[PDB]
Amino acid sequence: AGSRLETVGSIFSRTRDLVRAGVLKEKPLWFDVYDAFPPLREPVFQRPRVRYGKAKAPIQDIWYHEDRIRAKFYSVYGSGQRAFDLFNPNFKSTCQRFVEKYTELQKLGETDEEKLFVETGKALLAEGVILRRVG
Amino acid sequence: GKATDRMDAFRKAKNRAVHHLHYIERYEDHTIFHDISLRFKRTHIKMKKQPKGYGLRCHRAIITICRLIGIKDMYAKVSGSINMLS
Amino acid sequence: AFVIPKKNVPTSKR
Amino acid sequence: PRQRAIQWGEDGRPFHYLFYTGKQSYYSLMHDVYGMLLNLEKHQVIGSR
Amino acid sequence: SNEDLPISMENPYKEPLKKCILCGKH
Amino acid sequence: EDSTDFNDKILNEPLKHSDFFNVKELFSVRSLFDARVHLGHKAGCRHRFMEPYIFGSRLDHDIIDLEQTATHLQLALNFTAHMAYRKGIILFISRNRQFSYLIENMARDCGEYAHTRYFRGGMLTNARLLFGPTVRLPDLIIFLHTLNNIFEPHVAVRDAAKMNIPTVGIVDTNCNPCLITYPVPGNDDSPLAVHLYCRLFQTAITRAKEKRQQVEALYRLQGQK
Amino acid sequence: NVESFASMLRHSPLTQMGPAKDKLVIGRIFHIVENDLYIDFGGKFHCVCRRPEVDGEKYQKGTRVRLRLLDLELTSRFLGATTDTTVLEANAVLLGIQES
Ligand code: FES
Ligand SMILES: [Mg+2]
Numbered sequence: 001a002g003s004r005l006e007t008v009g010s011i012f013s014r015t016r017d018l019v020r021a022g023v024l025k026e027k028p029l030w031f032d033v034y035d036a037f038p039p040l041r042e043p044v045f046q047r048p049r050v051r052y053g054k055a056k057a058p059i060q061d062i063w064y065h066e067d068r069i070r071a072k073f074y075s076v077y078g079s080g081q082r083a084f085d086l087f088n089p090n091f092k093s094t095c096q097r098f099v100e101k102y103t104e105l106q107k108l109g110e111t112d113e114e115k116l117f118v119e120t121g122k123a124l125l126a127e128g129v130i131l132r133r134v135g
Numbered sequence: 136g137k138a139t140d141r142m143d144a145f146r147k148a149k150n151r152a153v154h155h156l157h158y159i160e161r162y163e164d165h166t167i168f169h170d171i172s173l174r175f176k177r178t179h180i181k182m183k184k185q186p187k188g189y190g191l192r193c194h195r196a197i198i199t200i201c202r203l204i205g206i207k208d209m210y211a212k213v214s215g216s217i218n219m220l221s
Numbered sequence: 222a223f224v225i226p227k228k229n230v231p232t233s234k235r
Numbered sequence: 236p237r238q239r240a241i242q243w244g245e246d247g248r249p250f251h252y253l254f255y256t257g258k259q260s261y262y263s264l265m266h267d268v269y270g271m272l273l274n275l276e277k278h279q280v281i282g283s284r
Numbered sequence: 285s286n287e288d289l290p291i292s293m294e295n296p297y298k299e300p301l302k303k304c305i306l307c308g309k310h
Numbered sequence: 311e312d313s314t315d316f317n318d319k320i321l322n323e324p325l326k327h328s329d330f331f332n333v334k335e336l337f338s339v340r341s342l343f344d345a346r347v348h349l350g351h352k353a354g355c356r357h358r359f360m361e362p363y364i365f366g367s368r369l370d371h372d373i374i375d376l377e378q379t380a381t382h383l384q385l386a387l388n389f390t391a392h393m394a395y396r397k398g399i400i401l402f403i404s405r406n407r408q409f410s411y412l413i414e415n416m417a418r419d420c421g422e423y424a425h426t427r428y429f430r431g432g433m434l435t436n437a438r439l440l441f442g443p444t445v446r447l448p449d450l451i452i453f454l455h456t457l458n459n460i461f462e463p464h465v466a467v468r469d470a471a472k473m474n475i476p477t478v479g480i481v482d483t484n485c486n487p488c489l490i491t492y493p494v495p496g497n498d499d500s501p502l503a504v505h506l507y508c509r510l511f512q513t514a515i516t517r518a519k520e521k522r523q524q525v526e527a528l529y530r531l532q533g534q535k
Numbered sequence: 536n537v538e539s540f541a542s543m544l545r546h547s548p549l550t551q552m553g554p555a556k557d558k559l560v561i562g563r564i565f566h567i568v569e570n571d572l573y574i575d576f577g578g579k580f581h582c583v584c585r586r587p588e589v590d591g592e593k594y595q596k597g598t599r600v601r602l603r604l605l606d607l608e609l610t611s612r613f614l615g616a617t618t619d620t621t622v623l624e625a626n627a628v629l630l631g632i633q634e635s
Contacts, residue, residue, distance in 0.1 A: 084552050087563075089344065273411070371608070
């Protein structure tokens with residue numbers, strides 16, 4: 001027979017009960033496969049409701065330590081002339097190169113961001129990188 | 136079931152009800168597991184678990200539905216609106 | 222049981 | 236009148252991959268014409284009604 | 285554990301608040 | 311006397327192994343990342359029920375957690391293979407018109423069925439009247455896109471549940487996975503992501519069907535001698 | 536020594552790009568409908584740009600072109616809506632053809 005009450009339980013809970021009660025003479029083909037390897041969440045219908053008052057989503061903004069460097073670099077120099085190639089997974093941009101050198105100089109033991117930022121730019125200039133400031 | 140003729144209404148409702156079957160858990164196949172108190176819209180139904188031999192002491196419509204489910208012993212009080220659909 | 226008059230062989234019978 | 240043949244065998248599996256659309260013949264034709272247009276793009280009256 | 289997990293900061297890319305032409309002028 | 315042995319050696323045997331079809335090798339977290347499976351919609355398009363699967367928001371762009379996708383994808387592919395091995399009818403449903411041609415080819419290649427067109431009301435809940443009294447409905451429905459073209463759940467998601475048909479579904483950050491049996495959180499917009507799904511589901515189905523032929527043949531050869 | 540997903544995300548080219556506003560990227564024309572050019576730059580959605588009149592003939596399927604990204608996804612919430620309306624498209628300006 002079957003049960004079309006898609007809002008009451010799941011397809012398995014409904015099917016299992018009807019097979020047990022004897023309404024369904026033969027269990028469906030997928031029944032045995034479902035029971036052996038069930039999903040992580042049982043597919044039960046649930047109604048979405050609006051968040052009211054102080055309820056907020058638990059999704060958090062993804063930030064990293066180097067975002068402080070990236071934000072500063074983009075403000076000082078702007079978008080590098082080299083165009084971002086997002087197709088290449090190993091592509092390194094001028095900003096990424098700056099972060100890398102900045103981090104390398106941080107390992108040396110520099111504690112001043114401004115001084116460390118200045119030293120980072122100087123190292124890149126020596127390597128032949130073109131750093132045209134917005135000014 | 137809806138139809139101009141009463142026979143067509145009887146048939147439609149009867150055949151369609153079979154595709155919308157619940158499964159009711161009966162304690163020892165004669166009563167409910169625990170007392171159920173609920174409000175559907177404006178209808179209040181308060182069902183109580185009862186021992187064997189108590190019988191069906193509830194609203195007549197509930198008696199009919201209980202016999203179809205297989206519940207033998209239960210008490211229920213219907214308050215608020217006595218709408219048959221609710 | 223109240224017996225609903227049962228339908229005959231489909232009249233349309235395409 | 237020209238009647239369409241049975242579209243599924245004894246096992247019950249329909250014979251056409253677009254059977255469940257209800258218009259397997261029509262949608263199969265649309266699929267073919269769309270395919271030809273794709274290949275043509277990648278490669279590149281009065282009497283008739 | 286792992287050091288690549290996101291950390292909690294205030295939006296560093298957040299732009300400064302806009303100001304009207306008369307902001308700070310009597 | 312022979313039917314029980316046949317069923318046990320063929321039908322019940324695969325159900326005793328965790329990965330009978332070895333779908334683990336088909337994909338890795340690296341391969342999923344290279345296909346942009348983790349790129350979700352903007353935070354303002356987020357569906358409340360998709361929050362458990364979202365790793366976070368990178369500049370107001372939800373990032374789907376690929377560590378959950380791997381476990382969710384593993385279960386969906388396993389279920390798909392077991393259904394193809396059991397000679398079940400698999401139906402691919404999708405209303406994204408950028409991929410209608412691709413999905414219709416993928417179904418024809420793996421010997422399955424696709425419905426990429428406008429879904430007429432009652433295809434599943436009124437099939438015996440639309441197709442015929444002896445029509446057989448699908449045993450599995452794989453949603454490559456669960457939303458219709460007005461950004462609402464595809465009607466077949468509800469109708470499949472009414473007909474007690476299990477469903478596999480790629481659910482982006484703006485989808486509702488409550489009624490999908492085997493939801494797979496992932497990007498459903500990028501061609502690379504959709505192409506990867508098609509390759510993964512086509513391979514699992516083809517492998518499962520071939521394994522069914524190999525097992526049956528061995529059982530028959532041994533039966534004679 | 537298996538790379539975790541968090542490691543992949545931190546070092547992804549899209550993450551190091553940061554805000555996409557006014558970032559020059561390289562796309563590929565994957566589909567062309569009359570003058571409308573559909574370009575893929577590696578994001579979730581593609582960007583649609585009109586065929587430049589200066590050298591329209593050069594822009595063909597597969598041609599790599601330079602873009603200036605404005606938004607990864609065009610979305611907005613309008614009066615009375617419970618969720619954002621999404622165009623399923625990115626906003627970008629076609630600068631020219633990439634030449635090596
Ligand atoms: S913005 Fe108007 S007084 Fe500052
Ligand atoms: Mg999407």
